[PDB]
Amino acid sequence: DANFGRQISYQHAAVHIPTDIYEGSTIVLNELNWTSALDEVFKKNREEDPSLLWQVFGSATGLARYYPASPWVKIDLYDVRRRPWYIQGAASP
Amino acid sequence: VAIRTIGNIMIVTTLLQFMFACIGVQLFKGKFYRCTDEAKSNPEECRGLFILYKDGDVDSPVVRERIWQNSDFNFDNVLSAMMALFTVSTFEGWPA
Ligand SMILES: *[C@@H]1O[C@H](CO)[C@@H](O[C@@H]2O[C@H](CO)[C@@H](O[C@@H]3O[C@H](CO)[C@@H](O)[C@H](O)[C@H]3NC(C)=O)[C@H](O)[C@H]2NC(C)=O)[C@H](O)[C@H]1NC(C)=O
Numbered sequence: 001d002a003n004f005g006r007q008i009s010y011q012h013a014a015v016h017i018p019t020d021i022y023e024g025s026t027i028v029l030n031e032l033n034w035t036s037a038l039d040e041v042f043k044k045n046r047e048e049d050p051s052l053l054w055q056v057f058g059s060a061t062g063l064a065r066y067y068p069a070s071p072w073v074k075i076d077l078y079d080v081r082r083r084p085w086y087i088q089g090a091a092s093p
Numbered sequence: 094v095a096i097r098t099i100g101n102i103m104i105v106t107t108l109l110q111f112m113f114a115c116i117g118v119q120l121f122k123g124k125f126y127r128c129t130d131e132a133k134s135n136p137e138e139c140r141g142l143f144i145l146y147k148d149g150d151v152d153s154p155v156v157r158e159r160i161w162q163n164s165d166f167n168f169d170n171v172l173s174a175m176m177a178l179f180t181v182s183t184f185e186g187w188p189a
Pocket residue numbers: 033034035036037
């Protein structure tokens with residue numbers, strides 16, 4: 001679609017897990033359940049404003065779930081916990 | 094004829110090697126395991142992939158899988174202990 005440089009899907013939300021973080025662990029899997037309830041409110045947010053760009057939840061466990069679902073972009077070194085937008089909301093100056 | 098000369102010593106040395114193998118089994122039973130990356134201690138944390146830096150350079154990373162490996166010469170049981178102690182007695186690889 002337009003207003004997006006890549007191919008996306010509004011059916012659900014993609015999940016990004018850092019390379020150095022093992023998916024399937026108890027910490028990750030528990031976080032991977034209760035964040036599935038964000039899919040409906042991801043859709044509900046986008047219905048009033050169809051001009052809405054990426055909505056992302058950066059968990060303290062390391063995984064980042066964003067909407068709409070779209071494939072991730074050499075090795076991967078992205079960690080959501082080190083991003084500037086995550087850091088300013090984690091603490092104060 | 095020569096071979097029978099050490100009919101006694103060759104027995105006491107085998108007995109002592111067996112006793113030391115049993116002591117080593119008691120001392121280092123299963124303690125020689127380690128993970129592929131030197132950052133995970135438990136076997137539960139040694140699962141999945143990890144980022145490895147070649148030659149200690151932070152600018153050249155490679156993706157490798159971490160495996161909870163065991164030492165080639167371990168002390169898990171009596172036979173392995175005897176093999177490890179024999180290799181030690183040959184004076185090869187004993188510092189490692
Ligand atoms: C964490 O994962 C759990 C299992 O994967 C989820 O628990 C399951 O949720 C299902 C739907 O939400 C439940 O199905 C229905 O539950 C209602 C009770 O509210 C009942 O009608 C029936 O039990 C069932 N109906 C059916 C099957 O037609 C499961 O019962 C429930 N438990 C399981 C499968 O053991 C959690 O929802 C999930 N957590 C979050 C936050 O999503």
